[PDB]
Amino acid sequence: HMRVWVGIDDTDSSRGMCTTYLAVLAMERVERELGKVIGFPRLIRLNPTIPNGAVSFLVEVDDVGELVDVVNEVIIEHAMLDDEKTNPGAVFVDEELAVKLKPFADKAIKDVLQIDEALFVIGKYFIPHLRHKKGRGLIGALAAVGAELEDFTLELIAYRYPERFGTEREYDEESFFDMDYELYPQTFDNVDWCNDVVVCIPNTPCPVLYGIRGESVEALYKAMESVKTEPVDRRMIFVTNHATDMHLIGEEEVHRLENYRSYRLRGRVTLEPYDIEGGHVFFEIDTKFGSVKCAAFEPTKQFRNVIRLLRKGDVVEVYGSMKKDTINLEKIQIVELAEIWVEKNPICPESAGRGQGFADEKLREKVERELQPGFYEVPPSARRHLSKPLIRMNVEGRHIFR
Template sequence: MSSEITKMVIGIDDTDSREGMCTTYLCALLRDELSSFAQVISEPILVRLNPTIPFKTRGNASVALFIECDDKEKIIGHVTDKVSSMACLDNENTNPGVVFVDEEQFDSVSDKLSSFFKRAVKDVITIDEAKELASELNLEFQAFKNGRGLIGALSACGAMLDPDWDHTYEFLAYREKDVWGTRRSVDESSLFEADKQTYPDTWDTVDLVNDMVVCVPHSGDPVLYGIRGKDAGSVKKAASFVVSEPVERVCIYRTNQGTDMHLVSVSSISDIEEMHSYILEGEVCSEPVTIRGGHTIFMLKDVSGDVIDCAAFEPTKNFRELIRKLIPGDRVVVYGSVTENTINIEKIKITELSKAYDIRNPPCPSCGKRMKSSGSGQGYRCKKCSTSSDIPEKTEVKRDIVPGFYEVPPCARRHLAKQLLRFKNEEVPVFSGR
C-alpha cells in the first residue's frame, strides 16, 4: 500500500570481503534500481572510517543514498533483499548493516548521527554501541550476522545529514559481472593522459615518480577504476579520457577521502592510543635505520622526553630516501596512524634542521698529518711529533634536505590522507609525492 511522499536516507556497510564484491557497487546498483520507483535526491555518500581497525574488509568504506519515495516499505524491502542476496555472507568477516532514516526523524537524529560519524573516523566503536544508538534513535535497521556493518551504516547516514565536513569526489567505474575476478583491461597510457589533462583538479590516478597506475585495483571486486578529485565535473572529465574494457555502470560519490578527517592533534606521546591516527610534533632523537623488509624507522621525542617509533614502510618507496636524511636534533611534525606503538607516516613537516658536521681526526700542528686515535675517550696523538689533542676536527656540512612539507607517493597513499595539493597557506614549502 502506498503512503505519503517522504524523504529517506539509507546507510549500508560491510557487504564485501577481501575476495570480492564491493559496498560501493551495491550502492550504485541500488541507486539505479530505486530510480525506477523513487527519486534519488543527491549524489551518494562514500565515507572511509578509522583506517586502523583490524577487522575491516578492504577499504573500510560505507555508503549512503538520499531518496524521495511514496512507498517506504517497498524501499526497505528492496534494499534489504538486495543486501541479503549480494553480500558475501559466507565470509566470516562480512557482517552487513543497513539503516533507514525517515524524513520525520531528520531533525531529532542528525546531530547524534553526525557525531557518531566523526567519531567512527577517528575512534574505535563497538557493535553494541551502534545497536544501542540505532535503538535509542528509534531507527529502522537490519543487522546481518553480528551486525558490525551497523557502525558504518549509521556513520554514512550521519555524513549524509551533515553538510559541514570537508569532502572530495570519486568517479567509480564498474565491470560487467561476467568478468569479475579476471584481469582488468585498462589502457595505462590513457590514465596518464587523464592525469595530464586534469591534474591538479584530480589526483592519485597515476604515480609519476614511480611510473605506476594507482587508480586500478587488483582484487576480485567489481571496480574497474576510480578517479578522485575536487569536484564531480573534474572526475567526470578525467574519466572521459580512459580507454578500457566495457563498463557496466558508473557512479560519482561525495566522500571524505583525502581530508585527514582521521587525524587528531596531540602534544604528548602519553596521549597516543593504539588504533588511532595523530598529528604529533617532536624532535628526531635517533639516526634513521632501515630494517629487514626495507622499512625505515627513527625515534621521535616529545617535550616531556617520551619517545615513539616513526616508520616509513617499504610501500612508501622514494619517501624513505627523505626520511633517511633526518638526523638527531631535527624538528618535525608527523602525520599518521599508530599500530604496535609505531606511527605509520603519511606526511611529514620538517620545521627546523639541526646542523650536521663532518668529524675527523685533527691535523698535527707541527707536521700537518692527521693524528691517530689514542683509544676511546683518550684523544688523539701524532706518532711522529708526539703532539696530542683532545678535540677532533669538526666541519659543518650542507644538508641535502630543506624544511618543508613532504608526503608519501600516490602509490602508498591511504584513502583518508590529505594530499599536499589540497593544503593552503602553508608557511613552509610543499613538496608533492608525485
C-alpha cells in the same frame, strides 16, 4: 512522501563485492520502484586501522516500509553472507535525524567503537534498521549517514559487465597519464609518474573497473570521456572524505597516544634513522607524550630517501597512525633543521694522552645537510585513502612527488 538516509556496510568478501556496488544496485531499484535518489551517494571512509569504507545515500520514498524491504533484498542476493568476515547492516535515518549522528560517525572514523554503541543509537531514535548475522555493519552504516563533510572530494567509479567479472581488466593504460597530464591537480592521486603505476585500477573481484578521484564534476566528466578502457556498464560519482585527513588527531587534544588511532605530533629526533631487511626505516622522536618511534616502511618508496636524512635534534611534525606503538608516516614536516659538525685529529705534515693534546683542539667542521624544511609526503602508489595529499594543502615547503 519522506526523506530518508540509507546507510550500508560490510557486505563484500575476500572474493565477493565492493560494498559500493550493492549500494548502487539498491539505488537502481529504489529509483525505479519507490522514489528518487537525491544528489550523489556518499562513500565515507571510517577508521583505517580497524581490526574500510561504508556507503550511504539520501532517498525520498513514499513509504519507508517498502524501502527497507527493497534494500534488504539486494542485501539478501548480491551480498556474500556465506563468508564469516561479512556481517551486513542497514540503517534508514529520517532526513532531520541525520546531523544528530555526526558525533557517532566522528567517533567511528577517529576511534574504535563496539556494536553496542551503535545499537544504543538506533534505540535512542528508534531508527528502522537491518542487522544480519552479527551485523557489525550497523557501525559503519550509521557512521556513513552521519559523517560530516566540511571538505570533501569526488570519485568516479566505473563498473564492468557481470559477464566480464573475473577477467583481468584491460585498458589503454597510457590514457590515464594523458589524463593526469591535463587535468591535474583537478583529478589527482590516480597515477604515479615516478613509481610508474596506474593506482586507480584495482585488481580485485569487485566489479569496480576504474576509480578516478578529483575535486569537481567538471574534471571527472572530462576525465571519463578522455580515457580508453574496456566497456563501461554502470558508473556513479561518490562524494567522499577521500584525501581529507579526517582521521588524524591533533596532539593538542589527548593525553595518551593509544594504538589504533591517527595523529599529528611535533618532535625532536632522538634516535637516528635506520633500516632492517626489507627497506623498512625507523626513527624515534621526542615528544610531549615522551618516547615515540616512527616507521617509514618500504611501500612508502621514494619517501625513505627523504626520511633517512633526518638528524638527531631536528624538529619535525609526523602525520600517521599508531600501531605497534609506532607512528606510520603518511607525511612529515621538517620544522627547523638542526646543524651537525664533525671532529677530526689535525695533521702536520693524532692523539697522545688524556689531556696531552696532539695541536690542542680537534678539527670541528659544520657539515651542510641536504634534507630541507617543508612538507614531504608519500608517493601516490603508497597513498592512503583518508590521507590528504599535499597538492591539496595550502601551506609552503611542499614537495609533491607526482
